[PDB]
């Protein structure tokens, strides 16, 4: 099928809002949540007994 | 060599002139050795029953005579300014010496004579052109400590010798473009370690000297002559075509070892970017090696019907299969070697 | 089913012979003057046979 594919703004828009854009927002959400939780964890705002996911 | 004892005499004066060149402690003795080597190599490569061999000899003559006169010119200028045989600090006349040596060696961007002349040759004179005639200019490059000009030559040689070999379906010009690509790996090793260059040159000449014998015996001057080449067992053609994966640098063959020692010595000397540029180059060289390897890896071919028996020389095919064994199972001799310590 | 039974029947005979006729080991305290061997840390006689004869010790690998 690839030999009938041309760079067109419809195909670029399909490849943008289909694949790249959910990857971008999902990576941004993961980075923002982990940065906030890492700042909370490294500042010292939570204790060792009141901490989620102790693997125990 | 073939059909005359005077060609054996020309080979003797060829070895004498090259060994006069590389042993010279002055640029003038190296220059006159290049004159002896040129004198020896004009009559081999000349044949009056071939219309293109004389044109190839003329192209070689004009390229080497222009490159030898520039080499003597900048040698005389180096003696004029810095009166010893070498130079204390690097200047432009050392770059002119290196450029005149790069025209002899066939590296890019002075590469253009080399595959345009290799269409006019046989296979044995091709092997003498791209192995022994690269002894004398490459060993004289070692006396010059220039990094930018050598680095430009390395990058241009590995870019062009990979890209340029895709278009030609003739095996002589394709193998000439492969020799341009393997010249860049030699020149990249020339400014880190002369011994590692000698090892890459010896194994490259070994793989060239075993790939010439498959083409010289059966007279394979084209890509589809490989597809029409008759063997009495298709497993034999499958094994004989593994030397192209060896020359492509694929482990566990023998030709992974010299590329690997160049990569190890380059990374110890803290060069990483041009090494990465030479990683992308050798994939394209392995790609146009695989178009030869189409002729044996599919195990069954629509072949021509009239030919039924294959013919070969006795001593040439006996010496060919000693080295084809060592071009496949040559990594079992990794414990025997002691140069690399 | 033939080859499963042809496997299981000597396995069942060996397991019954080990569990009935040679028996398991009994736990006991280590004597002060005795250094135990590498197969004496295991309860079952099949495990003792496997550790003593077939498998290497943990000390040798360590």
């Amino acid at each position: 099928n690839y030999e009938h594919f041309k760079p067109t703004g419809k195909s670029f828009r399909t490849g943008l809002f289909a694949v790249v854009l959910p990857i971008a927002l999902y990576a941004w959400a993961l980075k923002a949540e982990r940065d906030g939780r890492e700042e909370k964890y490294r500042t010292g705002q939570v204790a060792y007994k009141d901490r989620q996911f102790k693997f125990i | 060599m073939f059909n005359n004892s005077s060609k054996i005499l020309f080979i003797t004066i060829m070895i004498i002139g090259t060994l006069i060149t590389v042993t010279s402690n002055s640029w003038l003795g190296a220059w006159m050795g290049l004159e002896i080597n040129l004198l020896s190599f004009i009559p081999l490569l000349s044949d009056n029953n071939n219309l293109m061999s004389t044109e190839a000899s003329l192209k070689y003559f004009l390229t080497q005579v222009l490159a030898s006169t520039v080499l003597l010119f900048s040698s005389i200028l180096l003696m004029l300014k810095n009166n010893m045989n070498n130079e204390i600090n690097e200047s432009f006349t050392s770059m002119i010496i290196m450029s005149a040596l790069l025209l002899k060696s066939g590296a890019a961007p002075f590469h253009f004579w080399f595959p345009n002349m290799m269409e006019g040759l046989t296979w044995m004179n091709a092997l003498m052109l791209m192995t022994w005639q690269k002894i004398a200019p490459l060993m004289l490059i070692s006396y010059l400590n220039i990094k930018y000009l050598l680095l430009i030559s390395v990058i241009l040689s590995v870019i062009i010798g990979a890209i340029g070999g895709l278009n030609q379906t003739s095996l002589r010009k394709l193998m000439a473009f492969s020799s341009i690509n393997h010249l860049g790996w030699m020149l990249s090793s020339l400014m880190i370690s002369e011994s590692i260059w000698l090892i890459y040159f010896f194994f490259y000449s070994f793989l060239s000297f075993v790939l010439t014998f498959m083409f010289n015996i059966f007279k394979l001057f084209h890509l589809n002559q490989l597809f029409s080449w008759f063997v009495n067992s298709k497993i034999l053609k499958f094994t004989l075509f593994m030397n192209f994966l060896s020359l492509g640098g694929l482990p566990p063959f023998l030709g992974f070892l010299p590329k690997w020692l160049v990569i190890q010595q380059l990374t110890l000397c803290n060069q990483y970017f041009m090494l990465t540029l030479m990683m992308m180059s050798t994939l394209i060289t392995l790609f146009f090696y695989l178009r030869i390897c189409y002729s044996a890896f599919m195990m069954n071919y629509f072949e021509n019907n009239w030919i039924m028996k294959m013919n070969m020389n006795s001593i040439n095919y006996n010496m060919y299969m000693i080295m084809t064994f060592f071009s496949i199972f040559g990594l079992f001799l990794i414990s025997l070697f002691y140069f690399m310590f | 089913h033939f080859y499963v039974m042809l496997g299981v029947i000597p396995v069942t005979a060996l397991v019954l012979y080990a569990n009935i006729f040679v028996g398991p080991a009994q736990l006991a305290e280590i004597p002060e003057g005795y250094e135990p061997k590498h197969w004496e840390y295991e309860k079952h006689p099949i495990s003792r046979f496997i550790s003593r004869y077939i498998l290497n010790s943990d000390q040798q690998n360590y």
């Binding site: 989620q52 996911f53 102790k54 693997f55 125990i56 | - | -």
Partner: protein, 48 residues
């Protein structure tokens, strides 16, 4: 319609490990006022 329940049970198992054993019957009455255990119960409720 059963696979949604299967993956809700998978996420409940993934949350249940804060206190070690997935045998919930020894922890439900202890942790009826814990946010992680209500989220376990919500995933189990979605699966059921």
């Amino acid at each position: 319609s059963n696979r949604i329940g299967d993956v809700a049970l998978l996420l409940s198992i993934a949350w249940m490990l804060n206190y070690g054993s997935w045998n919930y019957i020894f922890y439900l009455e202890i942790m009826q006022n814990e946010f992680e255990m209500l989220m376990i119960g919500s995933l189990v409720m979605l699966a059921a």
